[PDB]
Amino acid sequence: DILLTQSPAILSVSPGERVSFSCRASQSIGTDIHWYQQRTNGSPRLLIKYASESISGIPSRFSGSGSGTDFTLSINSVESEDIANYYCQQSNRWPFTFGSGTKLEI
Amino acid sequence: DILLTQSPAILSVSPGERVSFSCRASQSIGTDIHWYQQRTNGSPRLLIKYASESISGIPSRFSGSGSGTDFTLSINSVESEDIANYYCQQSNRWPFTFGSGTKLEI
Amino acid sequence: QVQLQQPGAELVKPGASVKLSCKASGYTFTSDWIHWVKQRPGHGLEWIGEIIPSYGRANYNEKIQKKATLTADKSSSTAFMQLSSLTSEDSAVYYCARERGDGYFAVWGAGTTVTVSSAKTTPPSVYPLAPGSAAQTNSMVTLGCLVKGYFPEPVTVTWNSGSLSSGVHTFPAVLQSDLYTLSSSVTVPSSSWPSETVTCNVAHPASSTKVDKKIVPRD
Amino acid sequence: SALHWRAAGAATVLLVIVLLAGSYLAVLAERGAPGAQLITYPRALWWACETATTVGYXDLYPVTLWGRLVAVVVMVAGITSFGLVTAALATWFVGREQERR
Amino acid sequence: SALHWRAAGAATVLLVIVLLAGSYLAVLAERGAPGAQLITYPRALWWACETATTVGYXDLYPVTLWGRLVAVVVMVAGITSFGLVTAALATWFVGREQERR
Ligand SMILES: CCCCCCCCC(=O)OC[C@H](CO)OC(=O)CCC
Ligand SMILES: CCCCCCCCC(=O)OC[C@H](CO)OC(=O)CCC
Ligand SMILES: [K+]
Ligand SMILES: [K+]
Ligand SMILES: [K+]
Ligand SMILES: [K+]
Ligand SMILES: [K+]
Ligand SMILES: [K+]
């Protein structure tokens, strides 16, 4: 089964700065990667689907890129509401799997 | 020919605990991996076929998982009768080959 | 409206079994799958299994031990997950999620906090927290409410039934002698209190008890 | 409207049905098999089309017994339908050619 | 029962036979060639089906001379059989179209 590696586990950035979370798949999965946000005590929230497609209701500040084995979730000018845990998930091969998670810290 | 690597060669666990044997193939073999048990002085015995399929007559305690190049044989709550050598074998490409073996120790 | 509704909590004794539910609303299609995801405190998301209601077939994560059995009810649009022979290892939040058969989880339930303990259910005691008579005040004042003696987790604390979100901090619970305790904090402009009410709402799903506690000045 | 033409249209409607049912059942058959890729519906319908026309790039294909049985029904339904059209074009041409004589 | 229809049914029974014999002989031909994948019977029968219908995803294919010769017989038997059915559907449509006139 496809192993998704998110590194670093913790990312520290300064307000308004640009940040990038990384997700690497153990094998090639085209663009079948999805990103989720989960704030403290909250339930996960879909941010980007198929690696780079926008979701309605999500600030334009969020964007995704990559194809193959290497994926990036980016945030233009991070702000307080972005403090959370971020997960990638793949749907290319059965079974679906999640990455271990990156924590954003400001 | 496909090289199957079993590591560690020796695994020590405490009674009733959960254990996992690993088998890594040198190239991708879908789920064409089979597991066998061989007790001291005994002949090999089929435990799991095609990576995760049950065999009749084998305690439910035994389960397999994985696809691709990485496979796991698991034992829920190990007991004395499980002390033996464990081998994986692949049937994806000619010729069939065996892994070098993992010894379970309690 | 909330698309997936799940109970807030379930207490289960080691060895026993529980059946979690997930009631779905909104658009429903023949190509929908309902997934279950397990998350242990301080840890990540772990996929458990899935079921396609329209057909009734379920698949499970092979890398883990099978504690779950999934079923669905077409008429009541509800998916169920039967967890059996639980132990402390099985204590975690269990979320259900919906996938339109295209690979991503468009929407998630709020999750059911499951606790596997021999302990017993116990509602929380909610006490006020108003400044002491000698406490000087600035342009802002801080009030709070203490919630203790409860089990199992969790409890949800809101201020003025939600209308008061900004300036709120609810600390994580602490476990001591099979009972949890936590406090929530709220900060409003000093000139607005107590002229304008400030009540803390504390809900404890595991005992089906919700109580309020207005915060007024001492003596 | 002649028989050959009806059988053709009928073959086409049946093909579209086999494609949609094939897409649905392939996902149903394949989820649960570690490593399977024929597991979300939009790509399965595409897989169903390239199987029915026998192009078979692959980019996707079934790995389980039931997904393969489903694949064979799609193949046979597409080959039969395209063949029915060919045969209908033959009946048409033969009929009109006997008039030009 | 007309000839075209008999030749068709006969083509179908022969196809099923070529598929089972093809599966058996491909494994026979391929075991012994390092790297070969067409080596267990259930996947070889599936390989035989997707070759006969000419879909050719791939997921499996022969690497030895005899497995390839076996592949060509399967291809030709499938193309001939599906072609015989098409031609039988033509004979049927042409006959009934001469009655509607
Ligand atoms: C003649 C038959 C052609 C079939 C083409 C299938 C394309 C699948 C796809 O990539 O579709 C991608 C999109 C999402 O980007 O899925 C959808 O919601 C579209 C519904 C089909
Ligand atoms: C119309 C022709 C369809 C051929 C489909 C072949 C599927 C092979 C397979 O995966 O079969 C898998 C199983 C084992 O899991 O093999 C068996 O014991 C089944 C006997 C065919
Ligand atoms: K072709
Ligand atoms: K082809
Ligand atoms: K091809
Ligand atoms: K191909
Ligand atoms: K190919
Ligand atoms: K043709």
Q: Is D37 on the interface with A (CB under 8 A)?
A: yes
Per the CB < 8 A criterion, the answer to whether C70 and C59 are in contact is: no
Q: Is the CB of E59 under 6 A from ligand 2?
A: no
Per the CB < 8 A criterion, the answer to whether C117 and C15 are in contact is: no
Tell me which chain B residue has its CA closest to the CA of residue C63. B65
Q: Is C61 on the interface with A (CB under 8 A)?
A: yes
Are C and E close enough to touch, i.e. 3+ CB pairs under 8 angstroms? Answer: no
For CATH 2.60.40.10, list the domain ranges present in chain C: 1-118, 119-217
Q: Is A31 on the interface with C (CB under 8 A)?
A: no
Q: Is D42 on the interface with B (CB under 8 A)?
A: no
With H, G, I as helix, E, B as strand and everything else as coil, classify residue B30.
coil
Cis peptide before B44, with omega less than 30 degrees from 0?
Answer: no
Residues of D in contact with C55 (CB under 8 A): 28
Ligand nearest to the backbone CA of E53: 3
Tell me which chain E residue has its CA closest to the CA of residue D7. E93
Residue among D73, D85, D55, D68 nearest D17 (CA): D73
Per the CB < 8 A criterion, the answer to whether E10 and E99 are in contact is: no
CB atoms within 10 A of CB B105: 11
Residue among C77, C62, C63 nearest C25 (CA): C77
Residue type at position B32? D
Residues of A in contact with B68 (CB under 8 A): 1, 26-27
Spacing, Cα A17 to ligand 5 middle (Å): 49
Between CA D54 and CA D72 the distance in angstroms is: 11
Question: What CATH number does the domain located at C1-118 have?
Answer: 2.60.40.10
Q: Is B92 on the interface with E (CB under 8 A)?
A: yes
Q: Which helix (H) or strand (E) holds C98?
A: strand C92-99
Indicate the resolution in Å.
2.2
Specify the residue with its C-alpha closest to ligand 1, atom 20: D42
Architecture of domain B1-106: Sandwich (2.60)
Q: At CB < 8 A and 24+ separation, what contacts does E76-83 make?
A: E77/E14, E77/E15, E77/E18, E77/E52, E78/E15, E78/E18, E78/E51, E78/E52, E78/E53, E78/E54, E79/E52, E79/E54, E80/E11, E81/E11, E81/E12, E81/E14, E81/E15, E81/E52, E82/D79, E82/D83, E82/E53
Strand pairing category for C78-83 and C68-73? antiparallel
Structure tokens at E35: 């790297």
Query: What CATH number did the domain enclosing D24 receive?
Result: 1.10.287.70
Strand pairing category for C140-150 and C180-189? antiparallel
How was this structure obtained? X-ray
D70 CB contacts (<8 Å, ≥6 apart)? D22, D25, D26, D29, D62
Q: Is the CB of D76 under 6 A from ligand 2?
A: no
Q: What is the full DSSP assignment across chain A?
A: ---EEE--SEEE--TT--EEEEEEESS--TT-EEEEEE-TTPPPEEEEETTTEE-TTS-TTEEEEEETTEEEEEESS--GGG-SEEEEEE-SSSSPEE---EEEE-
What is the distance, to the nearest Å, from the Cα of residue A62 to the centroid of all Cα atoms in its chain? Answer: 10
Between CA C141 and CA E98 the distance in angstroms is: 98
Spacing, Cα D55 to ligand 3 middle (Å): 5
Between CA B104 and CA E47 the distance in angstroms is: 40
Residue D85 phi/psi, 5-degree rounding, is: -65, -45
Between CA C127 and CA B35 the distance in angstroms is: 61
Specify the residue with its C-alpha closest to ligand 2, atom 21: E42
Ligand 1, residue D49: give the atom nearest the CA: 2
Q: Is B91 on the interface with E (CB under 8 A)?
A: yes
Q: Where are the domains of chain B?
A: 1-106
Domain C119-217 class, CATH top level: mainly beta
Between CA E54 and CA D50 the distance in angstroms is: 12
Per the CB < 8 A criterion, the answer to whether D53 and D12 are in contact is: no
Tell me which chain B residue has its CA closest to the CA of residue A94. B67
CB atoms within 10 A of CB B61: 14
Q: Is the CB of D72 under 6 A from ligand 2?
A: yes
Full domain range(s) for residue E13: 1-57
Ligand 2, residue D64: give the atom nearest the CA: 10
List chains touching D (3+ CB pairs under 8 A).
A, B, C, E
